[PDB]
Amino acid sequence: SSRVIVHVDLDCFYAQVEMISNPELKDKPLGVQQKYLVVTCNYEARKLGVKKLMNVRDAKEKCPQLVLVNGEDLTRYREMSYKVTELLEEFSPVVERLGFDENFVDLTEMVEKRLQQLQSDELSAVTVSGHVYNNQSINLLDVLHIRLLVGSQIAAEMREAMYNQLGLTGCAGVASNKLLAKLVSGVFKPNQQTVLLPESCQHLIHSLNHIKEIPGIGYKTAKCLEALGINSVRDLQTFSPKILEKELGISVAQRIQKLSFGEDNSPVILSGPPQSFSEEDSFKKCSSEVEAKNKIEELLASLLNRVCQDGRKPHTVRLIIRRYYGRESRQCPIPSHVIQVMTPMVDILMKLFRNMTLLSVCFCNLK
Amino acid sequence: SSRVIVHVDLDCFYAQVEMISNPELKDKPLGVQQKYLVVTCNYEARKLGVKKLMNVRDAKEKCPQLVLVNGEDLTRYREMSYKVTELLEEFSPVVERLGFDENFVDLTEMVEKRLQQLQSDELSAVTVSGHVYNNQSINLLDVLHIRLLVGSQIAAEMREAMYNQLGLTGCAGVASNKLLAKLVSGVFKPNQQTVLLPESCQHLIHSLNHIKEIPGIGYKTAKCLEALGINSVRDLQTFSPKILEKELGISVAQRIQKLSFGEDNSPVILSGPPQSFSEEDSFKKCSSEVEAKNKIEELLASLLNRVCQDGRKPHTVRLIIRRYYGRESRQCPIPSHVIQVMTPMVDILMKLFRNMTLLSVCFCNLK
DNA sequence: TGGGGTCCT
DNA sequence: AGGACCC
DNA sequence: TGGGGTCCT
DNA sequence: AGGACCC
């Protein structure tokens, strides 16, 4: 029943991609910006206060030496993202993407195939590659420890190949399910890896400071957990199954309570090609109304080329909005013959507009 | 590009299935009932006024000689339904179900495979099997007429095999798309078949008396069409694309307007095994409230056995309701280990009940 | 106006 | 989750 | 608080 | 269609 999962997490991904394109930014503290935000920055900058998602100003007045590059156009990041995934796919086919810079790979079959290949002998010489989560002692006679170590060896090879073939660094974490692998991948933050032995599971999960830090617990369930008194991971573990059942509903509840013990049975799912391609414009005050379909000609132009390329054709169009959490969409089929340019598409987007701080087009339901 | 589609439509299906089970009903006018309704009756009864979906009383006082059988339990009808479909599948694999008693089969490849097998000779001796829609003359030199005739030959073989192997009669209609095949299957009503030549398409579509008779136009779009003045099929054909576009939305509108010309590009889709299994109880006044989960133990019992059997296991449960058009549901996952009896299931159905004229359970999302 | 079932938003 | 379609 | 993306109800 | 999650 037991699995060996690796979580691969690329360091400051857009900044890496930009640092490869312009090497005069390598030494220099680098911010990648979108509108008013600094969405990511390389190491040099991070250390001098720049962070997470700061202002192009609250972030410049915490570091004047800031280089900025625009990363609103996601194209190159998207391409390198799939290069990474394809590369992990070549190790083992079942790879799951999470955003552009994370991948889970189920290494179970591969770890076993290596283990069967060793003679009862070199097995005593199995070693770990990278850190062991809470500096825990390894027991070479524990079959689960041996498998996880062989998994940390695959992980280090994924990272070496990602570096040698694509020029990217990143972290990895090896554990027995996706929750834990992703929790432990970030213990040694910059370009390192960690393996979690079973005995330190509670240590890792109790090292969290709030239940929002558990992947799967979002902005909204966390506010509901709070309203109940639940704040630490231990409060969640010990809370009444009943009340939570009856309050977040059986599904959400009996799932996030397992997560609070480090238990998570969800399989790594094969992502394969994307289910949709969409593009957005942000702009606060700026869409008057009707005139700003011009906007609508551009996301199309961009998208059309991308949609093209993949080969597969979209059979659904969608348009999205906000005014001054709440966004609206209208969907419709894409007329069959127009599948097989812009012209009629703009038109069907323009009643999808009229039946109805930002605008987007999505191509969904590819075939 | 051109297709040959057959629509197979079983005569008074539940009554046939019951007439096979109890032959002392064969001569006798037979109603199959559910609650207060006579949902179907065989020929003998139909002719003496009994119809469609009448009262067990407004229908008995239009015919006192009525035998009634209960057909609330859909089990045997459901089994014979799939026997029919499997039998048509053996002619050509792409068969689409519509309710328990209709199937579309795309005969295009099969008609061509027969045509290639004939020598330039016997081709002049191709004949039709059954009626030609508006008594239209056949042109043996028209390649579309020849294909449709070979399609009426496949149809007659489907009907003979359905009769010889399963003991069921029914109608068939052969045409160039599903709209037309289904429109023309019912021209000769009891146990006969009709083939539609292209030149009589407008005749058939204008023989309709209201646009609700066009398959795809339902209760709600028909009321909207009315509100616009649109009543005949010809009003719909001639109505402003624009207004209708802008009023039912581009998708519904540009689709039902094509239908009003007899044009319909939708493929016959392979139904294969069912996407869900559900059971219902009706009862007006009767669910007090909480106590009537007892109800909830039964639909389960029934369902569990069925779900079992198919082999494939449901990963989603759902519960449905109405109070005194509008029904409510709550869905949730089925706990993994309980996939692999009743006990915990009733329980997860009973919070799905408490977060919340009739009740039902659905097993969906089989795997 | 039963007792099913499918796909779309 | 709910609407809309079909039998 | 960008500019993407996925699955569920 | 909209909510909820993740990066």
PDB file of C-alpha atoms in Angstrom, chain B residues 154-321:
ATOM      1  CA  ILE B 154     -30.005  -2.419 -42.288  1.00  0.00           C
ATOM      2  CA  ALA B 155     -32.965  -0.965 -40.377  1.00  0.00           C
ATOM      3  CA  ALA B 156     -35.308  -3.771 -41.389  1.00  0.00           C
ATOM      4  CA  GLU B 157     -32.619  -6.321 -40.334  1.00  0.00           C
ATOM      5  CA  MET B 158     -32.277  -4.567 -36.903  1.00  0.00           C
ATOM      6  CA  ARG B 159     -36.038  -4.850 -36.504  1.00  0.00           C
ATOM      7  CA  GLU B 160     -36.205  -8.450 -37.602  1.00  0.00           C
ATOM      8  CA  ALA B 161     -33.328  -9.346 -35.199  1.00  0.00           C
ATOM      9  CA  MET B 162     -34.962  -7.381 -32.364  1.00  0.00           C
ATOM     10  CA  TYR B 163     -38.141  -9.382 -32.955  1.00  0.00           C
ATOM     11  CA  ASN B 164     -36.540 -12.857 -33.529  1.00  0.00           C
ATOM     12  CA  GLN B 165     -33.991 -12.572 -30.654  1.00  0.00           C
ATOM     13  CA  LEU B 166     -35.834 -10.468 -28.069  1.00  0.00           C
ATOM     14  CA  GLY B 167     -39.540 -10.725 -29.036  1.00  0.00           C
ATOM     15  CA  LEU B 168     -39.847  -6.862 -29.366  1.00  0.00           C
ATOM     16  CA  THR B 169     -41.443  -4.823 -32.189  1.00  0.00           C
ATOM     17  CA  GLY B 170     -40.710  -1.244 -32.941  1.00  0.00           C
ATOM     18  CA  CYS B 171     -40.334   1.504 -35.577  1.00  0.00           C
ATOM     19  CA  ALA B 172     -37.273   2.785 -37.336  1.00  0.00           C
ATOM     20  CA  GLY B 173     -36.517   5.864 -39.349  1.00  0.00           C
ATOM     21  CA  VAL B 174     -33.608   6.392 -41.724  1.00  0.00           C
ATOM     22  CA  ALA B 175     -32.355   9.902 -42.633  1.00  0.00           C
ATOM     23  CA  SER B 176     -29.210  11.970 -42.951  1.00  0.00           C
ATOM     24  CA  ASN B 177     -29.025  13.293 -39.390  1.00  0.00           C
ATOM     25  CA  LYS B 178     -30.525  12.471 -35.933  1.00  0.00           C
ATOM     26  CA  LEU B 179     -33.226  15.168 -35.964  1.00  0.00           C
ATOM     27  CA  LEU B 180     -34.662  13.931 -39.205  1.00  0.00           C
ATOM     28  CA  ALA B 181     -34.306  10.172 -38.455  1.00  0.00           C
ATOM     29  CA  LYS B 182     -36.189  10.661 -35.243  1.00  0.00           C
ATOM     30  CA  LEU B 183     -38.816  12.844 -36.920  1.00  0.00           C
ATOM     31  CA  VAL B 184     -39.428  10.344 -39.625  1.00  0.00           C
ATOM     32  CA  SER B 185     -39.358   7.120 -37.501  1.00  0.00           C
ATOM     33  CA  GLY B 186     -42.797   7.903 -36.189  1.00  0.00           C
ATOM     34  CA  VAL B 187     -44.570   8.570 -39.543  1.00  0.00           C
ATOM     35  CA  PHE B 188     -45.908   4.945 -39.655  1.00  0.00           C
ATOM     36  CA  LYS B 189     -46.623   4.433 -36.077  1.00  0.00           C
ATOM     37  CA  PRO B 190     -47.072   0.919 -34.951  1.00  0.00           C
ATOM     38  CA  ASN B 191     -44.328  -1.602 -36.134  1.00  0.00           C
ATOM     39  CA  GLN B 192     -43.049  -0.119 -39.361  1.00  0.00           C
ATOM     40  CA  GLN B 193     -40.224   1.987 -40.844  1.00  0.00           C
ATOM     41  CA  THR B 194     -39.692   5.007 -42.950  1.00  0.00           C
ATOM     42  CA  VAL B 195     -36.796   6.390 -44.902  1.00  0.00           C
ATOM     43  CA  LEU B 196     -36.484  10.138 -45.603  1.00  0.00           C
ATOM     44  CA  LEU B 197     -35.054  11.194 -49.041  1.00  0.00           C
ATOM     45  CA  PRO B 198     -33.378  14.663 -49.067  1.00  0.00           C
ATOM     46  CA  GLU B 199     -35.941  16.313 -51.303  1.00  0.00           C
ATOM     47  CA  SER B 200     -38.750  15.828 -48.699  1.00  0.00           C
ATOM     48  CA  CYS B 201     -36.884  17.321 -45.781  1.00  0.00           C
ATOM     49  CA  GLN B 202     -38.913  20.586 -45.857  1.00  0.00           C
ATOM     50  CA  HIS B 203     -42.174  18.627 -46.265  1.00  0.00           C
ATOM     51  CA  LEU B 204     -41.353  16.663 -43.015  1.00  0.00           C
ATOM     52  CA  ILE B 205     -40.180  19.616 -41.005  1.00  0.00           C
ATOM     53  CA  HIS B 206     -43.233  21.763 -42.111  1.00  0.00           C
ATOM     54  CA  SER B 207     -45.594  18.834 -41.333  1.00  0.00           C
ATOM     55  CA  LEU B 208     -44.893  19.707 -37.603  1.00  0.00           C
ATOM     56  CA  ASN B 209     -47.659  21.861 -35.944  1.00  0.00           C
ATOM     57  CA  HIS B 210     -45.637  23.512 -33.326  1.00  0.00           C
ATOM     58  CA  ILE B 211     -41.921  24.169 -32.666  1.00  0.00           C
ATOM     59  CA  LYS B 212     -42.086  22.188 -29.334  1.00  0.00           C
ATOM     60  CA  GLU B 213     -42.347  19.142 -31.645  1.00  0.00           C
ATOM     61  CA  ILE B 214     -38.787  19.698 -32.769  1.00  0.00           C
ATOM     62  CA  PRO B 215     -36.523  17.459 -30.604  1.00  0.00           C
ATOM     63  CA  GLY B 216     -34.155  19.815 -28.781  1.00  0.00           C
ATOM     64  CA  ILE B 217     -36.814  22.433 -28.306  1.00  0.00           C
ATOM     65  CA  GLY B 218     -38.199  21.971 -24.746  1.00  0.00           C
ATOM     66  CA  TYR B 219     -40.865  23.228 -22.442  1.00  0.00           C
ATOM     67  CA  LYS B 220     -38.885  26.349 -21.578  1.00  0.00           C
ATOM     68  CA  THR B 221     -37.451  27.486 -24.925  1.00  0.00           C
ATOM     69  CA  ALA B 222     -40.911  26.899 -26.519  1.00  0.00           C
ATOM     70  CA  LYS B 223     -42.491  29.376 -24.002  1.00  0.00           C
ATOM     71  CA  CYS B 224     -39.763  31.851 -24.827  1.00  0.00           C
ATOM     72  CA  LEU B 225     -40.280  31.337 -28.563  1.00  0.00           C
ATOM     73  CA  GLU B 226     -44.014  32.022 -28.084  1.00  0.00           C
ATOM     74  CA  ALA B 227     -43.402  35.223 -26.178  1.00  0.00           C
ATOM     75  CA  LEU B 228     -41.685  36.338 -29.353  1.00  0.00           C
ATOM     76  CA  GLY B 229     -44.574  35.579 -31.715  1.00  0.00           C
ATOM     77  CA  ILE B 230     -42.786  32.461 -33.010  1.00  0.00           C
ATOM     78  CA  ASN B 231     -45.266  29.592 -33.336  1.00  0.00           C
ATOM     79  CA  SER B 232     -44.839  27.650 -36.504  1.00  0.00           C
ATOM     80  CA  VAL B 233     -41.673  26.025 -37.722  1.00  0.00           C
ATOM     81  CA  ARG B 234     -41.732  28.596 -40.550  1.00  0.00           C
ATOM     82  CA  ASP B 235     -41.900  31.510 -38.121  1.00  0.00           C
ATOM     83  CA  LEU B 236     -38.733  30.123 -36.491  1.00  0.00           C
ATOM     84  CA  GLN B 237     -36.929  29.721 -39.811  1.00  0.00           C
ATOM     85  CA  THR B 238     -37.758  33.211 -40.904  1.00  0.00           C
ATOM     86  CA  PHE B 239     -37.204  34.922 -37.491  1.00  0.00           C
ATOM     87  CA  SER B 240     -34.382  37.500 -37.085  1.00  0.00           C
ATOM     88  CA  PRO B 241     -31.176  35.640 -36.260  1.00  0.00           C
ATOM     89  CA  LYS B 242     -30.240  38.698 -34.362  1.00  0.00           C
ATOM     90  CA  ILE B 243     -33.084  38.996 -32.026  1.00  0.00           C
ATOM     91  CA  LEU B 244     -33.042  35.291 -31.208  1.00  0.00           C
ATOM     92  CA  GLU B 245     -29.251  35.414 -30.782  1.00  0.00           C
ATOM     93  CA  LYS B 246     -29.651  38.234 -28.415  1.00  0.00           C
ATOM     94  CA  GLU B 247     -32.487  36.567 -26.516  1.00  0.00           C
ATOM     95  CA  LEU B 248     -31.849  32.853 -25.977  1.00  0.00           C
ATOM     96  CA  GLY B 249     -28.133  33.451 -26.273  1.00  0.00           C
ATOM     97  CA  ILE B 250     -25.933  32.583 -29.196  1.00  0.00           C
ATOM     98  CA  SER B 251     -25.724  28.875 -28.415  1.00  0.00           C
ATOM     99  CA  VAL B 252     -29.368  27.887 -27.963  1.00  0.00           C
ATOM    100  CA  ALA B 253     -30.332  30.252 -30.805  1.00  0.00           C
ATOM    101  CA  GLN B 254     -28.076  29.463 -33.630  1.00  0.00           C
ATOM    102  CA  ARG B 255     -28.610  25.711 -32.801  1.00  0.00           C
ATOM    103  CA  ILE B 256     -32.529  25.675 -32.759  1.00  0.00           C
ATOM    104  CA  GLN B 257     -32.671  27.808 -35.799  1.00  0.00           C
ATOM    105  CA  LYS B 258     -30.699  25.249 -37.760  1.00  0.00           C
ATOM    106  CA  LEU B 259     -33.045  22.585 -36.376  1.00  0.00           C
ATOM    107  CA  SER B 260     -36.042  24.496 -37.772  1.00  0.00           C
ATOM    108  CA  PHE B 261     -34.496  23.947 -41.301  1.00  0.00           C
ATOM    109  CA  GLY B 262     -33.935  20.214 -40.638  1.00  0.00           C
ATOM    110  CA  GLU B 263     -30.184  20.777 -40.176  1.00  0.00           C
ATOM    111  CA  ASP B 264     -28.424  19.047 -37.337  1.00  0.00           C
ATOM    112  CA  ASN B 265     -24.754  18.188 -37.261  1.00  0.00           C
ATOM    113  CA  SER B 266     -24.617  16.580 -33.809  1.00  0.00           C
ATOM    114  CA  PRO B 267     -22.820  13.098 -33.983  1.00  0.00           C
ATOM    115  CA  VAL B 268     -24.331   9.891 -32.715  1.00  0.00           C
ATOM    116  CA  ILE B 269     -22.403   9.500 -29.462  1.00  0.00           C
ATOM    117  CA  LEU B 270     -21.444   5.984 -28.094  1.00  0.00           C
ATOM    118  CA  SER B 271     -23.463   5.639 -24.843  1.00  0.00           C
ATOM    119  CA  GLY B 272     -21.688   2.543 -23.516  1.00  0.00           C
ATOM    120  CA  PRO B 273     -22.394   1.907 -19.773  1.00  0.00           C
ATOM    121  CA  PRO B 274     -24.464   4.247 -17.718  1.00  0.00           C
ATOM    122  CA  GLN B 275     -22.801   7.316 -15.926  1.00  0.00           C
ATOM    123  CA  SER B 276     -25.144   6.842 -12.885  1.00  0.00           C
ATOM    124  CA  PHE B 277     -27.822   4.586 -11.152  1.00  0.00           C
ATOM    125  CA  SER B 278     -30.453   6.242  -9.183  1.00  0.00           C
ATOM    126  CA  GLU B 279     -33.822   5.264  -7.604  1.00  0.00           C
ATOM    127  CA  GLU B 280     -36.778   7.463  -6.474  1.00  0.00           C
ATOM    128  CA  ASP B 281     -39.813   7.572  -4.100  1.00  0.00           C
ATOM    129  CA  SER B 282     -42.944   9.801  -4.991  1.00  0.00           C
ATOM    130  CA  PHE B 283     -45.423  10.688  -2.215  1.00  0.00           C
ATOM    131  CA  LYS B 284     -47.369  14.042  -1.907  1.00  0.00           C
ATOM    132  CA  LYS B 285     -47.924  15.165   1.885  1.00  0.00           C
ATOM    133  CA  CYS B 286     -46.139  12.010   3.126  1.00  0.00           C
ATOM    134  CA  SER B 287     -42.556  12.855   4.120  1.00  0.00           C
ATOM    135  CA  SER B 288     -43.268  14.309   7.464  1.00  0.00           C
ATOM    136  CA  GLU B 289     -39.478  15.311   7.700  1.00  0.00           C
ATOM    137  CA  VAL B 290     -36.562  13.514   9.662  1.00  0.00           C
ATOM    138  CA  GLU B 291     -38.525  10.251  10.241  1.00  0.00           C
ATOM    139  CA  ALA B 292     -38.652   9.509   6.518  1.00  0.00           C
ATOM    140  CA  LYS B 293     -34.987   8.422   6.146  1.00  0.00           C
ATOM    141  CA  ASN B 294     -36.578   4.816   6.271  1.00  0.00           C
ATOM    142  CA  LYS B 295     -37.439   5.649   2.778  1.00  0.00           C
ATOM    143  CA  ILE B 296     -33.636   6.190   2.554  1.00  0.00           C
ATOM    144  CA  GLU B 297     -32.796   2.698   3.557  1.00  0.00           C
ATOM    145  CA  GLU B 298     -34.786   1.207   0.867  1.00  0.00           C
ATOM    146  CA  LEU B 299     -33.609   3.123  -2.296  1.00  0.00           C
ATOM    147  CA  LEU B 300     -30.230   2.193  -0.984  1.00  0.00           C
ATOM    148  CA  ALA B 301     -30.919  -1.496  -0.729  1.00  0.00           C
ATOM    149  CA  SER B 302     -32.147  -1.723  -4.258  1.00  0.00           C
ATOM    150  CA  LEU B 303     -29.320   0.504  -5.552  1.00  0.00           C
ATOM    151  CA  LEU B 304     -26.585  -1.379  -3.753  1.00  0.00           C
ATOM    152  CA  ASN B 305     -27.291  -4.655  -5.512  1.00  0.00           C
ATOM    153  CA  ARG B 306     -27.462  -2.854  -8.917  1.00  0.00           C
ATOM    154  CA  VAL B 307     -24.203  -0.882  -8.261  1.00  0.00           C
ATOM    155  CA  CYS B 308     -22.645  -4.105  -7.190  1.00  0.00           C
ATOM    156  CA  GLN B 309     -23.476  -6.146 -10.325  1.00  0.00           C
ATOM    157  CA  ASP B 310     -22.253  -3.616 -12.901  1.00  0.00           C
ATOM    158  CA  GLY B 311     -18.935  -4.191 -11.220  1.00  0.00           C
ATOM    159  CA  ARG B 312     -17.632  -0.647 -11.544  1.00  0.00           C
ATOM    160  CA  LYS B 313     -17.891   1.292  -8.259  1.00  0.00           C
ATOM    161  CA  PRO B 314     -19.511   4.693  -7.650  1.00  0.00           C
ATOM    162  CA  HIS B 315     -17.341   7.380  -6.146  1.00  0.00           C
ATOM    163  CA  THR B 316     -20.107   9.950  -5.594  1.00  0.00           C
ATOM    164  CA  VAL B 317     -23.381   9.863  -3.691  1.00  0.00           C
ATOM    165  CA  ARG B 318     -26.288  12.260  -4.053  1.00  0.00           C
ATOM    166  CA  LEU B 319     -29.573  12.874  -2.422  1.00  0.00           C
ATOM    167  CA  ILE B 320     -32.586  14.625  -4.080  1.00  0.00           C
ATOM    168  CA  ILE B 321     -35.882  16.229  -2.928  1.00  0.00           C
TER     169      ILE B 321
END
